[PDB]
Amino acid sequence: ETLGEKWKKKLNQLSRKEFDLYKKSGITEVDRTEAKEGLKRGEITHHAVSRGSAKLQWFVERNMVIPEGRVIDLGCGRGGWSYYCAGLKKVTEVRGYTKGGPGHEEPVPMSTYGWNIVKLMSGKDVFYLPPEKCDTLLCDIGESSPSPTVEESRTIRVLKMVEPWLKNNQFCIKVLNPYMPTVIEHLERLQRKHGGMLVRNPLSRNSTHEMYWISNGTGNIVSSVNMVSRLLLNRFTMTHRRPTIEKDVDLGAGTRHVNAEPETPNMDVIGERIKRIKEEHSSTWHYDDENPYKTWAYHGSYEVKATGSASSMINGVVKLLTKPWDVVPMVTQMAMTDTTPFGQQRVFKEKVDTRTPRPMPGTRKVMEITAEWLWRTLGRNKRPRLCTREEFTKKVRTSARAAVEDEEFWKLVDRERELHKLGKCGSCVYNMLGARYLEFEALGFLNEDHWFSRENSYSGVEGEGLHKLGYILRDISKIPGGAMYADDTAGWDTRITEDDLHNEEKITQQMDPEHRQLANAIFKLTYQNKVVKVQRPTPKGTVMDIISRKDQRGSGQVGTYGLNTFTNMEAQLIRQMEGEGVLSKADLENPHPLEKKITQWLETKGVERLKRMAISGDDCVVKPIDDRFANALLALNDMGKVRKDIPQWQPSKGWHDWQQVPFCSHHFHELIMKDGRKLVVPCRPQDELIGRARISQGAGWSLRETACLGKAYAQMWALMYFHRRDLRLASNAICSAVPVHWVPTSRTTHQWMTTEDMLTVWNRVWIEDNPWMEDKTPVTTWEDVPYLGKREDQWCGSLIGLTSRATWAQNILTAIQQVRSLIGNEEFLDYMPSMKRFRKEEESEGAIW
Ligand SMILES: Nc1ncnc2c1ncn2[C@@H]1O[C@H](CSCC[C@H](N)C(=O)O)[C@@H](O)[C@H]1O
Ligand SMILES: [Zn+2]
Ligand SMILES: [Zn+2]
């Protein structure tokens, strides 16, 4: 009797209760909550039809199987494997086959990225199908059964059927019952003939002993099978082991054309940079032929060491205080950020590795026209200038702070600067410093002189602040016209065309020859051409790939916020023209459109249209003259700026209430104080704020560093989200647990980064320095500081009314004392009497006994 047979007997003895717990015991699975809800509501993009997609992902990213050419998916079912293979590089065609009908899953039509090459066919029994020419053979067919003898026959029948399909090509077939003796005989027979290796997938549940025969690998079958049996028999002991949860795969959307997909880069610009990297790492420099890069130019690779973590460090301070939110899924999801080399490749493929189609000649014309009009308007007063070393140093001080004191660092800059003056680049490489200074030296004037301030840009909101954004949107709502629209763009930086960059290049026309020659270098050598390093796992280890592309946008740049704000202002303007009827479908296709009607529209109506918008980076809020703006989608899509989570040809939905308008990941409320005065406060789903608070940027932070981080978020809540009952209570709880004298430190210098009394700060922010507050009468206590409506608060994710929150908020005194005990004998202060409940529980309970 084999080892596998002993496992089956134990599996059958388990009750239905014991079976369900052991099934997902210690395994790995993906969060299908958002996916299943989406498919239920009829969402056709970004989603995977089943868990098979991520199940097949585990093999590909480890190079166990590399799907090439025609891909045949025997037993596609829902089509989990097919839609995933569609988004792969070396795949040219995907064909699916499933029996379907009653009792069997039917193929689910999707519009994910690469759907156009996917061909799913129902009513196909693979056992009666003659083999076809394919460079990749996939099979996930196998039905489990309590009797191992039954699984034995079902496994062998599949093996005999998938055999003629394998002709020195990539493959990945599912083996239902690998532990049966007669099955192994066939496996060993097929191993000597087609090679490969049998591998167990961690995403497979413990209820099945299924293993997958991959093409790329080697090893002993008999040993590997028994190791799986020993594992499943070992997991019988420990059952309550929580399954490792991972993020599901984003299959994106849109059609895929393999012919016009690859990248044709320029070399004489970036070649010097590549050469220096190659010579530095000439020890292990090589060219990986199986690179997954599609729309990016692959140059080479070299061996490195692993960098990054699968999970993020949890701020223990706030976690001990936000106990009721330990059961909330949304809060947990925000700490599941994967930064491992495996994750870097997963993130790259799903969002970074895409190509935006070249805009129509007519559209390219209007974009150029509006750009020159916009730059001339932005520079009506301010003149472009060169930033200084003194400015750079001052902002750095307010390691990295030690690198500026090193004189050798500044001389390296000069050597790189003179190259830029010669139209050459050598050391400017982006990662997933000296280059950043050179950009600041040229384009830093946009932020320092505040080019995108509302006083100068009419639409921009740079330097205003979060607490003033709400008042801005309220003023916009007063402007007559249609509803307020606010569409978010899916991956803005990945949708910047080459035409968009050339329009941003026109700013150099207002610069001095010595400034212009340096600025054009930054645009041409660092923006319109760039080299990025990115980690990638290989069967030999971790390597660093060198890629390049001549468009899109670098996330970590100096002019990231600026240029995105500029182009977005341009993008929304064109859409209004389409809405008003200025630009027609013919005009966008016409390479020679009359600029008379466009210029006249900009010279006359152009100013007011800018006053109807509030734009910050990719986020934008537009209140057009009418609701024709909603159906204006021809130009917005042709520019490559496709909206997120919505069909490309579906009219946008606007709001006539400014309180429901989303902007900068926030909505705003207008509440009424006890004195009758009105305030406009920022707001967002409560699970997000707590989710951000329970994470800690970086790892290996001491208790003090985590406590100082906690106090920062705490005072942030007390200043911005005071209107929330749960957050204000948590804020005072943290401040009570965190030592008073300890200075809050984190990656900021906002208005909550001080040691002053927050009450006095609140009066300075919302009363003193508030231009929308005519009555400067100060507020003497937090009890006069208004909350949201209980109905309003609960809808925003509050937990008020629940037993868990009720138990917490009243037993908060214990958790605070617990934190204080861990810190030690230091000086604290009770922030709980700041609110009414504990103040009445101190004037009563205190005076009684
Ligand atoms: N004889 C047969 N011929 C073709 N398909 C069959 C078959 N017997 C079963 N199937 C199909 O095989 C599929 C196995 S489940 C497929 C899951 C797939 N990998 C995904 O990720 O969606 C079932 O959907 C079943 O309908
Ligand atoms: Zn350079
Ligand atoms: Zn709200």
Numbering used by the authors: 7 to 404, 420 to 453, 478 to 794, 801 to 900
From the reporting publication:
NS5, the largest NS protein at 103 kDa, consists of an N-terminal methyltransferase (MTase) domain possessing three activities necessary for cap synthesis (guanylyltransferase, guanine-N7-methyltransferase, and nucleoside-2’O-methyltransferase) and a C-terminal RNA-dependent RNA polymerase (RdRp) domain that carries out de novo RNA synthesis. The MTase (residues 1–262) adopts the SAM-dependent methyltransferase fold composed of four helices surrounding a central 7-stranded β-sheet, similar to previously determined flavivirus MTase structures. The C-terminal RdRp (residues 273–900) adopts the canonical right hand polymerase fold, consisting of fingers, palm, and thumb subdomains. We have determined the crystal structure of dengue virus NS5 and show that the NS5 dimer is likely the biological assembly of NS5, and RNA synthesis and RNA capping may be coordinated by the dimer.
The crystallographic ASU contains eight copies of full-length DENV3 NS5, in which four sets of dimers (AB, CD, EF, and GH) are arranged in a saddle-like shape. Thus the relative arrangement of MTase and RdRp domains within a monomer and the arrangement of monomers within a dimer are conserved in all eight molecules. The NS5 construct used to solve the crystal structure (NS5-Δ6) contained a six-residue deletion (795WSIHAH800) in this priming loop, which was rationally designed to eliminate the need for this movement. This protein has higher polymerase activity than the wild-type (WT) protein when a subgenomic RNA is used as a template. Although no SAM or S-adenosyl-L-homocysteine (SAH, a byproduct of the methyltransferase reaction) were added during purification or crystallization, SAH is clearly visible in the electron density in the active site. In the current structure, the linker is well ordered, and has complete density connecting the MTase and RdRp domains. The linker is in an extended conformation and makes extensive interactions with each domain. The MTase interacts mainly with the fingers subdomain of the RdRp, and buries ~1000 Å2 of surface area as calculated by the program PISA. The periphery of the core MTase domain in one NS5 molecule interacts with the base of the palm subdomain in the second NS5 molecule, and buries 1100–1200 Å2 of surface area between monomers in each pair. Because of the arrangement of dimers within the 8 copies of NS5 in the ASU, there is a second type of dimer interaction (type II dimer) only observed between monomers A and F, and between D and G.
